[PDB]
Design a protein around this motif. Structure first.
Motif, short mmCIF file in Angstrom:
data_model
loop_
_atom_site.label_atom_id
_atom_site.label_comp_id
_atom_site.label_asym_id
_atom_site.label_seq_id
_atom_site.Cartn_x
_atom_site.Cartn_y
_atom_site.Cartn_z
N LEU B 111 0.85 -1.18 0.00
CA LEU B 111 0.00 0.00 0.00
C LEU B 111 0.90 1.24 0.00
CD1 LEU B 111 -2.50 1.17 2.71
CD2 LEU B 111 -2.11 2.03 0.42
N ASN B 112 1.86 1.26 0.92
CA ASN B 112 2.77 2.39 1.05
C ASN B 112 3.46 2.74 -0.26
OD1 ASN B 112 4.52 4.19 2.95
ND2 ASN B 112 5.98 3.05 1.69
N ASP B 113 4.02 1.74 -0.94
CA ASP B 113 4.71 1.99 -2.19
C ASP B 113 3.77 2.46 -3.29
OD1 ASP B 113 7.07 1.17 -0.95
OD2 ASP B 113 6.88 -0.89 -1.67
N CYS B 114 2.59 1.86 -3.35
CA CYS B 114 1.61 2.24 -4.36
C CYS B 114 1.27 3.71 -4.20
CB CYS B 114 0.34 1.41 -4.22
SG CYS B 114 -0.90 1.88 -5.45
N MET B 115 0.94 4.10 -2.98
CA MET B 115 0.60 5.48 -2.72
C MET B 115 1.79 6.41 -2.92
SD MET B 115 -1.98 5.31 0.52
CE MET B 115 -2.52 7.03 0.38
N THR B 116 2.95 6.03 -2.40
CA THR B 116 4.14 6.88 -2.54
C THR B 116 4.53 7.12 -4.00
OG1 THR B 116 5.01 5.99 -0.42
CG2 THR B 116 6.53 7.27 -1.81
N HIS B 117 4.57 6.06 -4.80
CA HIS B 117 4.94 6.21 -6.21
C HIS B 117 3.95 7.10 -6.98
CE1 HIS B 117 7.68 2.96 -5.33
NE2 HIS B 117 8.07 2.85 -6.59
N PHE B 118 2.65 6.84 -6.82
CA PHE B 118 1.64 7.63 -7.52
C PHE B 118 1.66 9.11 -7.13
CE2 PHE B 118 -2.29 9.43 -8.85
CZ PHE B 118 -2.53 8.81 -10.08
N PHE B 119 1.81 9.36 -5.84
CA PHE B 119 1.83 10.72 -5.30
C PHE B 119 2.95 11.53 -5.95
CE2 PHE B 119 2.74 14.10 -2.34
CZ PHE B 119 1.53 14.39 -1.73
N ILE B 120 4.16 10.98 -5.90
CA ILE B 120 5.35 11.62 -6.45
C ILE B 120 5.35 11.70 -7.97
CG2 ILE B 120 7.87 11.39 -6.69
CD1 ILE B 120 7.95 10.40 -3.82
N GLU B 121 4.93 10.62 -8.62
CA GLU B 121 4.88 10.58 -10.07
C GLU B 121 3.94 11.65 -10.61
OE1 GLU B 121 7.39 7.38 -11.69
OE2 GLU B 121 6.29 9.08 -12.54
N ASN B 122 2.82 11.83 -9.93
CA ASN B 122 1.82 12.79 -10.37
C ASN B 122 1.95 14.20 -9.81
OD1 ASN B 122 -0.60 11.06 -11.94
ND2 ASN B 122 0.71 9.84 -10.59
N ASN B 123 3.08 14.49 -9.17
CA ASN B 123 3.32 15.82 -8.62
C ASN B 123 2.18 16.30 -7.72
OD1 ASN B 123 5.84 16.46 -10.15
ND2 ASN B 123 4.46 16.26 -11.91
N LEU B 124 1.67 15.42 -6.87
CA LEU B 124 0.57 15.78 -5.99
C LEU B 124 0.92 16.79 -4.91
CD1 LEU B 124 -1.05 13.93 -7.58
CD2 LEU B 124 -1.56 12.55 -5.57
N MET B 125 2.18 16.89 -4.53
CA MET B 125 2.53 17.87 -3.51
C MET B 125 2.31 19.29 -4.04
SD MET B 125 5.06 16.55 -5.30
CE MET B 125 5.85 15.24 -4.37
N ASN B 126 2.21 19.42 -5.36
CA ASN B 126 2.01 20.72 -5.99
C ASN B 126 0.57 21.23 -5.86
OD1 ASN B 126 4.71 21.03 -7.05
ND2 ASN B 126 4.19 19.52 -8.63
N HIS B 127 -0.36 20.32 -5.60
CA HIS B 127 -1.77 20.67 -5.45
C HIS B 127 -2.28 20.32 -4.05
CE1 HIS B 127 -0.78 19.80 -9.60
NE2 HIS B 127 -1.84 20.48 -10.02
N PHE B 128 -1.37 20.14 -3.10
CA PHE B 128 -1.76 19.78 -1.75
C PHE B 128 -1.05 20.61 -0.70
CE2 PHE B 128 -2.24 16.48 1.74
CZ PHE B 128 -3.62 16.68 1.86
N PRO B 129 -1.49 21.87 -0.54
CA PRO B 129 -0.93 22.82 0.42
C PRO B 129 -1.50 22.61 1.81
CG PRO B 129 -1.87 23.90 -1.53
CD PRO B 129 -2.47 22.54 -1.40
N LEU B 130 -0.71 22.03 2.71
CA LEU B 130 -1.18 21.83 4.08
C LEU B 130 -1.08 23.17 4.79
CD1 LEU B 130 -0.51 19.01 3.05
CD2 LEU B 130 -0.03 18.35 5.39
N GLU B 131 -0.95 24.23 4.00
CA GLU B 131 -0.86 25.59 4.51
C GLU B 131 0.20 25.72 5.61
OE1 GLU B 131 -4.30 27.02 6.75
OE2 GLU B 131 -4.25 28.85 5.54
#
Lengths: 19, 131
Positions: B111-131
């Motif tokens: 689960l961890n790898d699946c989520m980690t790879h997809f998150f990073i591959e798709n540049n999700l940190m760019n649309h997820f501002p924890l303010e």
């Protein structure tokens, strides 16, 4: 189906930023 | 932020919702974000239950082989904070409902790898501002 859950999660995610 | 930071954050978040007895020390910043994400996913689930009757259960019985399909489809047309929170909520669900709480198994790592790879591959940190 995983596809239905996918639509429901998108609906919720889109309405989340709002409601 | 850093791709390593997010990899670290994801694992920490999953271990926390999995109620893993062993505490893998992380910076205070990481814990703070794990806390924010857990709270968000619960608010998100609250909305999901108001609109729909169904649980994630049925669709996630084949998660080990379709989770990736679900994440791609979740962001097929766009990416926003709300869908990203749903992304983590799917993770919280797997750890809390499907997998057994209290142990960190190979399935968790899957689960961890699946989520980690997809998150990073798709540049999700760019649309997820924890303010």
């Amino acid at each position: 189906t995983m596809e239905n859950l996918s639509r429901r999660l998108k609906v919720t995610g889109d309405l989340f930023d709002i409601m | 932020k850093s791709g390593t930071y997010w990899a670290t954050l994801i694992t920490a978040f999953l271990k926390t919702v999995s109620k893993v007895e062993e505490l893998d020390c992380v910076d205070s910043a990481v814990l703070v974000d794990v806390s924010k994400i857990i709270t968000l996913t619960q608010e998100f689930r609250r909305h999901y239950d108001s609109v729909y009757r169904a649980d994630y259960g049925p669709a996630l019985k084949n998660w080990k082989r379709d989770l990736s399909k679900l994440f791609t489809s979740l962001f097929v047309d766009v990416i926003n904070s709300g869908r990203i929170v749903g992304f983590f909520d799917v993770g919280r669900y797997v750890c809390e409902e499907v997998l057994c709480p209290g142990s960190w198994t190979e399935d968790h790592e899957l689960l961890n790898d699946c989520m980690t790879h997809f998150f990073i591959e798709n540049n999700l940190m760019n649309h997820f501002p924890l303010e």
